Amino acid sequence: KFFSYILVYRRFLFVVFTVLVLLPLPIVLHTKEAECAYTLFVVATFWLTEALPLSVTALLPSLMLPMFGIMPSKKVASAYFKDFHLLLIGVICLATSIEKWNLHKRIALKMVMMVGVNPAWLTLGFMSSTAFLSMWLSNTSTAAMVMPIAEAVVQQIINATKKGHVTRKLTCLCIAYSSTIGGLTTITGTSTNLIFAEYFNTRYPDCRCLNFGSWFTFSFPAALIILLLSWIWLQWLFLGFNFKEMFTKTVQQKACAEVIKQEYQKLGPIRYQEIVTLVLFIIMALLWFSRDPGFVPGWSALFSEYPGFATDSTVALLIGLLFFLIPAKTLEIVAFDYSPLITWKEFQSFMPWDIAILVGGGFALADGCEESGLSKWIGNKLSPLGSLPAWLIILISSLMVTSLTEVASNPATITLFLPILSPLAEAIHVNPLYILIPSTLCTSFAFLLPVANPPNAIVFSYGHLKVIDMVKAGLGVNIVGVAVVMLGICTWIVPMFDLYTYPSWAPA
Amino acid sequence: KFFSYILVYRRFLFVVFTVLVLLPLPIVLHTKEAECAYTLFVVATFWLTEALPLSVTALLPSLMLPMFGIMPSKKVASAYFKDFHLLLIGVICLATSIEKWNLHKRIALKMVMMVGVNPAWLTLGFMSSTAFLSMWLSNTSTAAMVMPIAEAVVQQIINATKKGHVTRKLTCLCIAYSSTIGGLTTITGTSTNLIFAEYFNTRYPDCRCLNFGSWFTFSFPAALIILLLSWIWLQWLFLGFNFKEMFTKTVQQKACAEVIKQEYQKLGPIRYQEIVTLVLFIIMALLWFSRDPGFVPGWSALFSEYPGFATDSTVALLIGLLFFLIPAKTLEIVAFDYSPLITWKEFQSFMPWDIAILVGGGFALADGCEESGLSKWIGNKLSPLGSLPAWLIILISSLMVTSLTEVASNPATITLFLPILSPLAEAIHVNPLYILIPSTLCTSFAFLLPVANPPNAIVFSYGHLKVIDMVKAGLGVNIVGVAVVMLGICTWIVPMFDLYTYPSWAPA
Ligand code: NA
Ligand code: NA
């Protein structure tokens, strides 16, 4: 019975073994260079294998590092709060209000019904709705909400046969990929973008070119091209791309339209909470764009001479906190009080208060690798290197990030490589964004295994996909994504970000 | 129908009215001194009236202040993390593990059964158990858990008659008061202590005399004396204090002992999770005390020459994160995996992630009142004053804090007065602790109205108390608490804190 017991408690045994087996490195060295490497290896292993929760692992460098004589040092000019925390709080308020009233279901069903009834057009509508929802909501929640609806749609469309199996695989894969693809577009879409934004804001406080509007402007074309190419590739791989059929309704089309319509009525008539949430969401969609657009000069906002009147944090929370006071539900007296349309206990959830601890642990580990001699021990390997051109370094960095994120969680991968890429970016005397942006975009490209990211695991949990097919589709999707990211870096990101010219905010 | 509509939506109307009616102060002045006072008044009104959640109000100074031209300034030497955040995380892990397995119920029932069956001794046992539980758990949760048990106990003891009504009032009041009284003993007992600890750590980073062991050592005698005197006073007010009966069992005693025992079996036999949680809790009880005790020299811990080997944060989390990996519950396969005895989604709740935003808003408001001229406009009133002796300033400060906390939430009161008391403490050239400690202790003394603090509201929610009786008991309890706090400040806190001598960490 030992075999079953070992196979059950793999997590505890692996944690204990990983902790214990690296003790030779400190004990037979008694050197700070080895003692910091011990902590780095343990934390990296726990992050990549997911033995403990990511925040739990990130808390480790604050505890085991001081035991070795290495303690947090240096200082900061953080003052308090940030321009990013406020924007994040506002976006989370918006997402909570959208989710708790099931407005996202109405939006998704409306788009699916409106796009059309052609199966290729139906998959395109599913992908577009999922990406649009994942722009604001989280990838995990968006996928877990959209998947049941699509499963019902395919079950009732096929109820009117390997074709159904193939179509269901196609729609599962397209939803899984579109969640992440739409995550790239906005800063709040994915926790990886949150980690990159926080790290860049802390490490380069002078740099302020990174914000919601600029991020959307430089990420939207890449996401759109990737979405279209991925839809085409998925359609071609499973079904056949009938160009003539793309270009009088059959019985099947009428039946599927009826099914979609009756699901839409099953959602129910619109309510006051849904309409007020939609109005506030539309108001938030504006005043974020048209403030400082990259291409079109926007003078409607930020035309005031007063400083700080128009900024992302202000326009975010000044509207978001309205979700905490607008009367939604009243109430045999029932205390005769209304409902705030959002309760603070609901905002306590749905909020990235674990990415904060994660990036804090990343900072602690990076600062630990700034004293002693581990940093120099790693950097002396750069002496034989460094003759490689910048584009080549970009190529290896992007390929390594994409390869690692296939078998590791995206936040762990980004927090593991970003504090390594940044010093390398500053060493070669190149714009740090030139290195970080392709790597940050490619981190989310984890399109191969259910273990890669939660959306893929949720999609595979329905047990209607095979690993071989998922890998076959994801190889093409990842190749297309990497190609489009490289094309964007070479073509249009540089003029709007000045990637070729070294910046003033970067250190000498 | 206008009257009912107004009486229902008082919160929204009051928020709008408070925001709008103070616009004369900025508009007809156009002065930064008035524009900062406008924000201060609005935030203070929202904090004291609880129109919006406290964190929502604390977010306001980050939004409306920059609109007036006043922006966050200065810098900090925070580095990252703290010695307090790690300890708080460890204590919250311990509390979550205790609560989710219903160990606190077993502890409370065991103490109640063990203390005795005499009604005075029964109330003393209830008070002692509630205080001991509230030392680690939160006051709100401790009261909300203990109250049903005591209600059942009194209902079945009286089932074997105004005496039952009087005894039930007595036990309700004693639980309500003991929750807060036990909250004072430890730093993590009450959110007010968290706010004071965070503010003191940020404003005086050099000062390190404030930690778990020192806080317990200087707060335990005061809490114990207050508890004993409050028990005596509550017993005398409602029942009669029969000294002869204090000093052969009657039928009523046998019946109540049987009722307590059968409730104890109703709790159920002990489990593995409960025993492992108790073992880890006992281990955490040690190694916090006996590390650096105030009176008895403790050399069992902190005897290592290695720096940072023995500290509160390390001994807290090195044991707390064990709650995240110890196998509690296994699992027709059910994936054959164990349960970590704590899930990160459970630690996301039960955690003071709103006090962080609250103290951040307090810092933002205080820093706003450091530039322009509002600080000088308030401080020029100190020129006629300042001849008052230090003890007199203590007296007015403590009375004002106690009076305000009767009708306001304790965290709001402490975050409103602490950034005002600290500059006053530094101005008179006196130890800041001498001012802050009596005020911080007296802040929790809110023993009069259900609106004062959540434990009183929960106790009154059962509807077996009257406001007149609650006020009558709370006046005596508050007088006793204030007297004991003053006696402690005069007698034994000074030798262990050096309150009479100005400290080096305080600014010149
Ligand atoms: Na998302
Ligand atoms: Na408590």
PDB file of N, CA and C in Angstrom, chain B residues 320-362:
ATOM      1  N   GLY B 320       3.579  29.294  10.643  1.00  0.00           N
ATOM      2  CA  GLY B 320       2.294  29.563  10.018  1.00  0.00           C
ATOM      3  C   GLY B 320       2.137  28.915   8.656  1.00  0.00           C
ATOM      4  N   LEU B 321       3.169  28.998   7.817  1.00  0.00           N
ATOM      5  CA  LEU B 321       3.107  28.375   6.499  1.00  0.00           C
ATOM      6  C   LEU B 321       3.053  26.857   6.572  1.00  0.00           C
ATOM      7  N   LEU B 322       3.364  26.266   7.728  1.00  0.00           N
ATOM      8  CA  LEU B 322       3.110  24.844   7.907  1.00  0.00           C
ATOM      9  C   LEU B 322       1.625  24.523   7.828  1.00  0.00           C
ATOM     10  N   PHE B 323       0.758  25.496   8.113  1.00  0.00           N
ATOM     11  CA  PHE B 323      -0.674  25.314   7.928  1.00  0.00           C
ATOM     12  C   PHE B 323      -1.063  25.192   6.464  1.00  0.00           C
ATOM     13  N   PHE B 324      -0.174  25.549   5.539  1.00  0.00           N
ATOM     14  CA  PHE B 324      -0.464  25.488   4.114  1.00  0.00           C
ATOM     15  C   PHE B 324       0.006  24.202   3.453  1.00  0.00           C
ATOM     16  N   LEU B 325       0.668  23.308   4.188  1.00  0.00           N
ATOM     17  CA  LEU B 325       1.188  22.081   3.605  1.00  0.00           C
ATOM     18  C   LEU B 325       0.927  20.828   4.429  1.00  0.00           C
ATOM     19  N   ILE B 326       0.508  20.951   5.681  1.00  0.00           N
ATOM     20  CA  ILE B 326       0.212  19.761   6.487  1.00  0.00           C
ATOM     21  C   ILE B 326      -1.013  19.059   5.910  1.00  0.00           C
ATOM     22  N   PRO B 327      -0.963  17.746   5.680  1.00  0.00           N
ATOM     23  CA  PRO B 327      -2.111  17.041   5.088  1.00  0.00           C
ATOM     24  C   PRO B 327      -3.220  16.848   6.112  1.00  0.00           C
ATOM     25  N   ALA B 328      -4.384  17.436   5.839  1.00  0.00           N
ATOM     26  CA  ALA B 328      -5.536  17.329   6.728  1.00  0.00           C
ATOM     27  C   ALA B 328      -6.546  16.296   6.240  1.00  0.00           C
ATOM     28  N   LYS B 329      -7.074  16.481   5.035  1.00  0.00           N
ATOM     29  CA  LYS B 329      -8.112  15.621   4.487  1.00  0.00           C
ATOM     30  C   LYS B 329      -7.647  15.056   3.156  1.00  0.00           C
ATOM     31  N   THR B 330      -7.716  13.735   3.019  1.00  0.00           N
ATOM     32  CA  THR B 330      -7.328  13.081   1.780  1.00  0.00           C
ATOM     33  C   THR B 330      -8.441  13.218   0.743  1.00  0.00           C
ATOM     34  N   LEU B 331      -8.212  12.631  -0.430  1.00  0.00           N
ATOM     35  CA  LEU B 331      -9.177  12.645  -1.527  1.00  0.00           C
ATOM     36  C   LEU B 331      -9.579  14.068  -1.910  1.00  0.00           C
ATOM     37  N   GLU B 332     -14.532   7.202  -7.957  1.00  0.00           N
ATOM     38  CA  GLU B 332     -14.252   7.035  -6.535  1.00  0.00           C
ATOM     39  C   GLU B 332     -12.801   7.382  -6.216  1.00  0.00           C
ATOM     40  N   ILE B 333     -12.042   7.751  -7.250  1.00  0.00           N
ATOM     41  CA  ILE B 333     -10.640   8.107  -7.051  1.00  0.00           C
ATOM     42  C   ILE B 333     -10.521   9.435  -6.311  1.00  0.00           C
ATOM     43  N   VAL B 334     -11.342  10.419  -6.685  1.00  0.00           N
ATOM     44  CA  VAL B 334     -11.342  11.759  -6.099  1.00  0.00           C
ATOM     45  C   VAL B 334      -9.940  12.350  -6.243  1.00  0.00           C
ATOM     46  N   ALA B 335      -9.281  12.032  -7.360  1.00  0.00           N
ATOM     47  CA  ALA B 335      -7.985  12.588  -7.748  1.00  0.00           C
ATOM     48  C   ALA B 335      -6.854  12.150  -6.825  1.00  0.00           C
ATOM     49  N   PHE B 336      -7.188  11.442  -5.747  1.00  0.00           N
ATOM     50  CA  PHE B 336      -6.221  10.914  -4.785  1.00  0.00           C
ATOM     51  C   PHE B 336      -5.186  11.968  -4.386  1.00  0.00           C
ATOM     52  N   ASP B 337      -5.688  13.069  -3.832  1.00  0.00           N
ATOM     53  CA  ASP B 337      -4.850  14.158  -3.352  1.00  0.00           C
ATOM     54  C   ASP B 337      -5.343  14.607  -1.984  1.00  0.00           C
ATOM     55  N   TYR B 338      -4.432  15.166  -1.196  1.00  0.00           N
ATOM     56  CA  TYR B 338      -4.760  15.587   0.156  1.00  0.00           C
ATOM     57  C   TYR B 338      -5.159  17.060   0.187  1.00  0.00           C
ATOM     58  N   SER B 339      -5.579  17.512   1.374  1.00  0.00           N
ATOM     59  CA  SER B 339      -5.954  18.893   1.620  1.00  0.00           C
ATOM     60  C   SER B 339      -4.884  19.593   2.450  1.00  0.00           C
ATOM     61  N   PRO B 340      -4.549  20.842   2.120  1.00  0.00           N
ATOM     62  CA  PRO B 340      -3.412  21.507   2.767  1.00  0.00           C
ATOM     63  C   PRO B 340      -3.673  21.971   4.190  1.00  0.00           C
ATOM     64  N   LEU B 341      -4.858  21.690   4.741  1.00  0.00           N
ATOM     65  CA  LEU B 341      -5.304  22.107   6.073  1.00  0.00           C
ATOM     66  C   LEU B 341      -5.648  23.593   6.095  1.00  0.00           C
ATOM     67  N   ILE B 342      -5.269  24.309   5.035  1.00  0.00           N
ATOM     68  CA  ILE B 342      -5.629  25.701   4.768  1.00  0.00           C
ATOM     69  C   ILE B 342      -5.551  25.909   3.264  1.00  0.00           C
ATOM     70  N   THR B 343      -6.586  26.498   2.681  1.00  0.00           N
ATOM     71  CA  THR B 343      -6.561  26.878   1.279  1.00  0.00           C
ATOM     72  C   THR B 343      -6.326  28.378   1.165  1.00  0.00           C
ATOM     73  N   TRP B 344      -5.623  28.779   0.103  1.00  0.00           N
ATOM     74  CA  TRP B 344      -5.308  30.194  -0.060  1.00  0.00           C
ATOM     75  C   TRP B 344      -6.564  31.037  -0.220  1.00  0.00           C
ATOM     76  N   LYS B 345      -7.632  30.465  -0.777  1.00  0.00           N
ATOM     77  CA  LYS B 345      -8.885  31.208  -0.865  1.00  0.00           C
ATOM     78  C   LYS B 345      -9.481  31.463   0.514  1.00  0.00           C
ATOM     79  N   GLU B 346      -9.200  30.592   1.484  1.00  0.00           N
ATOM     80  CA  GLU B 346      -9.654  30.828   2.850  1.00  0.00           C
ATOM     81  C   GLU B 346      -8.793  31.870   3.554  1.00  0.00           C
ATOM     82  N   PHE B 347      -7.489  31.887   3.272  1.00  0.00           N
ATOM     83  CA  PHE B 347      -6.628  32.922   3.828  1.00  0.00           C
ATOM     84  C   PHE B 347      -6.862  34.275   3.172  1.00  0.00           C
ATOM     85  N   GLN B 348      -7.426  34.295   1.963  1.00  0.00           N
ATOM     86  CA  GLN B 348      -7.799  35.560   1.341  1.00  0.00           C
ATOM     87  C   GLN B 348      -8.830  36.293   2.188  1.00  0.00           C
ATOM     88  N   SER B 349      -9.797  35.561   2.732  1.00  0.00           N
ATOM     89  CA  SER B 349     -10.688  36.101   3.743  1.00  0.00           C
ATOM     90  C   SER B 349     -10.013  36.014   5.108  1.00  0.00           C
ATOM     91  N   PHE B 350     -10.707  36.490   6.137  1.00  0.00           N
ATOM     92  CA  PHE B 350     -10.226  36.488   7.517  1.00  0.00           C
ATOM     93  C   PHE B 350      -8.936  37.280   7.687  1.00  0.00           C
ATOM     94  N   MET B 351      -8.585  38.129   6.722  1.00  0.00           N
ATOM     95  CA  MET B 351      -7.309  38.818   6.729  1.00  0.00           C
ATOM     96  C   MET B 351      -7.504  40.329   6.659  1.00  0.00           C
ATOM     97  N   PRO B 352      -6.732  41.103   7.428  1.00  0.00           N
ATOM     98  CA  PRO B 352      -6.882  42.570   7.450  1.00  0.00           C
ATOM     99  C   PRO B 352      -6.195  43.266   6.276  1.00  0.00           C
ATOM    100  N   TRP B 353      -6.686  42.992   5.071  1.00  0.00           N
ATOM    101  CA  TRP B 353      -6.313  43.718   3.860  1.00  0.00           C
ATOM    102  C   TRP B 353      -7.122  44.988   3.628  1.00  0.00           C
ATOM    103  N   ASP B 354      -8.054  45.334   4.515  1.00  0.00           N
ATOM    104  CA  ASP B 354      -8.691  46.644   4.435  1.00  0.00           C
ATOM    105  C   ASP B 354      -8.091  47.660   5.403  1.00  0.00           C
ATOM    106  N   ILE B 355      -7.514  47.211   6.523  1.00  0.00           N
ATOM    107  CA  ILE B 355      -6.746  48.122   7.372  1.00  0.00           C
ATOM    108  C   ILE B 355      -5.536  48.675   6.630  1.00  0.00           C
ATOM    109  N   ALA B 356      -4.965  47.906   5.701  1.00  0.00           N
ATOM    110  CA  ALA B 356      -3.855  48.424   4.907  1.00  0.00           C
ATOM    111  C   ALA B 356      -4.278  49.655   4.113  1.00  0.00           C
ATOM    112  N   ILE B 357      -5.399  49.556   3.395  1.00  0.00           N
ATOM    113  CA  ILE B 357      -5.903  50.694   2.633  1.00  0.00           C
ATOM    114  C   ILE B 357      -6.312  51.822   3.571  1.00  0.00           C
ATOM    115  N   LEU B 358      -6.857  51.475   4.738  1.00  0.00           N
ATOM    116  CA  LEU B 358      -7.281  52.497   5.691  1.00  0.00           C
ATOM    117  C   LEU B 358      -6.095  53.329   6.170  1.00  0.00           C
ATOM    118  N   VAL B 359      -5.022  52.665   6.599  1.00  0.00           N
ATOM    119  CA  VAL B 359      -3.850  53.393   7.072  1.00  0.00           C
ATOM    120  C   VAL B 359      -3.162  54.106   5.915  1.00  0.00           C
ATOM    121  N   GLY B 360      -3.261  53.567   4.698  1.00  0.00           N
ATOM    122  CA  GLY B 360      -2.745  54.291   3.547  1.00  0.00           C
ATOM    123  C   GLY B 360      -3.482  55.594   3.301  1.00  0.00           C
ATOM    124  N   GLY B 361      -4.811  55.563   3.396  1.00  0.00           N
ATOM    125  CA  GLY B 361      -5.576  56.792   3.283  1.00  0.00           C
ATOM    126  C   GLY B 361      -5.271  57.763   4.406  1.00  0.00           C
ATOM    127  N   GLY B 362      -5.057  57.240   5.613  1.00  0.00           N
ATOM    128  CA  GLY B 362      -4.635  58.095   6.709  1.00  0.00           C
ATOM    129  C   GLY B 362      -3.312  58.783   6.429  1.00  0.00           C
TER     130      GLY B 362
END
